[PDB]
Chains A and B, each alone.
Chain A
Amino acid sequence: GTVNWSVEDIVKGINSNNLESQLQATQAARKLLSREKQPPIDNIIRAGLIPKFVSFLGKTDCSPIQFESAWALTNIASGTSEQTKAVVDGGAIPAFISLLASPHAHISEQAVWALGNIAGDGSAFRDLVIKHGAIDPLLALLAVPDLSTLACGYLRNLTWTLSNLCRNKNPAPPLDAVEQILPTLVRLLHHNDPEVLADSCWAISYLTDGPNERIEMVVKKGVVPQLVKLLGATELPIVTPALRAIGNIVTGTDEQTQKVIDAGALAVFPSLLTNPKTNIQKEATWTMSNITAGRQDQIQQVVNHGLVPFLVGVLSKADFKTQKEAAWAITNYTSGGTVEQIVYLVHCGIIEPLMNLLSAKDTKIIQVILDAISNIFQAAEKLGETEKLSIMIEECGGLDKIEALQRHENESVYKASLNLIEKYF
């Protein structure tokens, strides 16, 4: 009945003086905008339909046209920035916010969805949705004794929209909006649905992606232990954002990093550092590098949890981007570690795989590795064992690489190479 109309028929119906004709034409628009292959968004916009849809959102008297127009506008708003802008320019934001209070669950849900697409465009529209007062009525929809009594699709859409209100930087969301949302987020983070859990974790990852003051707001809410629990989940879509959030937190202060250690995160790293998904290995190693950039007592926890052999493992064999994060983890470890911690590193076999990485055609990892060698030498000096170390590097082909690097395009590379050579070889 409302299948495969032309835009001109849609326009004719919507321009009729007849609410039922308008409803049928709006549903036909919804079906057009709902098809997988190239929905004619720009055609619908060019026909001048957005203002009509927006006015239909206000017809409390005709809940079906509210729904159909909400869905049509949702799909227009899901398009390019310019398409989302056309929806916002039509006055849709306050109209959708009014629909959050609808007695019809399917209509409020659609308003939630539409607002998520709008906010999802970027920080300006995100902040404009917030200024129009979206947060209170959204949070009210989740103010129930037990989340499990809500429809699953409904709760998933709400969680997703809230996560978009937490998303993007330049600038990050308003501090007071974040404080307003966080308690609900913490509660969703304890829900049992994997998709709600995944999107909640993503939201927490966005909020921890910034300066220490932002990390602190989250850490203060006591969520780190739950994040560490989620870090051990079987579902990759949960582990990925849980690990991103943990990684973000350890870019903060040593005290913030310690909360992650206290929560038990390190015991999960044997698995993460050998995870068959390369993204996970890379991000786990990145996280380790910011832990080895901390205090000597924190480095010692890395040692105690048996994680140095896992770092040697990743340095020995991994996707190259992971190997680069491992090199960083090693340079950090050697920069900040005691002599005894640094010795331990050598005994775990760090030298050969470090040397093997010197043949990389990546200038930055070479600098990083050379720096590690210097720090390791520095430690052997304090023990008067620099000759034993020189032989080791000599015996595994390390010297051939360092000597050959003396004649290298980069300046500080050739500098460090020649320095190492003359100072120790």
Chain B
Amino acid sequence: SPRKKRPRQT
């Protein structure tokens, strides 16, 4: 299942 939360990384 998709992530609840996602950082934007380099």
| Chain A residues with a Cβ under 8 A of chain B | 31, 33-36, 39, 71, 74-75, 77-79, 84, 110, 113, 116-117, 120-121, 160, 163-164, 167, 198-199, 202, 241
A75 to B4, Cβ gap below 8 A? no
B1-10 CB contact bits vs A (8 Å, 1 = yes)? 1111111111
Show 15 A/B contacts (Cβ-Cβ < 8 Å), sorted by A: A31-B10, A34-B8, A34-B9, A35-B10, A39-B7, A71-B8, A75-B7, A79-B5, A113-B6, A116-B5, A116-B6, A121-B4, A167-B4, A198-B2, A241-B1
Tell me the bound Cα distance from A198 to B2 in angstroms: 9
Q: Which of A31, A33, A110 contacts B7 (CB 8 A)?
A: A33
List chain A residues, Cβ under 8 A from B6.
78, 113, 116-117, 160
* Residue of B whose beta carbon sits closest to that of A206: B1
Tell me the bound Cα distance from A362 to B2 in angstroms: 32
* Residue of A whose beta carbon sits closest to that of B1: A202
Give the A-B pair count, Cβ closer than 8 A. Answer: 44
B2 to A117, Cβ gap below 8 A? no
Tell me the bound Cα distance from A75 to B9 in angstroms: 8
Q: How far is the CB of B3 from chain A (nearest CB, A)?
A: 8
Q: Which of B1, B2, B4, B10 gathers the greatest number of chain A CB atoms within 10 Å?
A: B2
B5 to A77, Cβ gap below 8 A? yes
3 tightest Cβ-Cβ pairs between the two chains A and B: A120-B4, A78-B7, A78-B5
List chain A residues, Cβ under 8 A from B3.
120
List chain B residues, Cβ under 8 A from A78.
5-7
List chain B residues, Cβ under 8 A from A117.
5-6
* Residue of A whose beta carbon sits closest to that of B10: A34
Q: How far is the CB of A148 from chain B (nearest CB, A)?
A: 22
Q: How far is the CB of B10 from chain A (nearest CB, A)?
A: 5
List chain A residues, Cβ under 8 A from B10.
31, 34-36
Tell me the bound Cα distance from A216 to B9 in angstroms: 39
* Residue of B whose beta carbon sits closest to that of A33: B7
B5 to A34, Cβ gap below 8 A? no
Tell me the bound Cα distance from A71 to B8 in angstroms: 7
Q: Which of A35, A71, A121 contacts B5 (CB 8 A)?
A: A121
B4 to A113, Cβ gap below 8 A? no
Q: Which of A36, A74, A77, A199 contacts B2 (CB 8 A)?
A: A199
Tell me the bound Cα distance from A78 to B4 in angstroms: 8
* Residue of B whose beta carbon sits closest to that of A76: B7
Tell me the bound Cα distance from A370 to B1 in angstroms: 35
Tell me the bound Cα distance from A198 to B6 in angstroms: 16
List chain B residues, Cβ under 8 A from A77.
5
Q: How far is the CB of B7 from chain A (nearest CB, A)?
A: 4
Q: Which of B3, B7, B9, B10 gathers the greatest number of chain A CB atoms within 10 Å?
A: B7
Tell me the bound Cα distance from A241 to B3 in angstroms: 13
List chain A residues, Cβ under 8 A from B7.
33-34, 39, 74-75, 78
List chain B residues, Cβ under 8 A from A198.
2
B4 to A164, Cβ gap below 8 A? yes
B1 to A120, Cβ gap below 8 A? no
Tell me the bound Cα distance from A247 to B5 in angstroms: 25
A36 to B9, Cβ gap below 8 A? yes
A84 to B5, Cβ gap below 8 A? yes
Tell me the bound Cα distance from A388 to B10 in angstroms: 70
List chain B residues, Cβ under 8 A from A121.
4-5
Tell me the bound Cα distance from A31 to B9 in angstroms: 9
Tell me the bound Cα distance from A202 to B10 in angstroms: 27
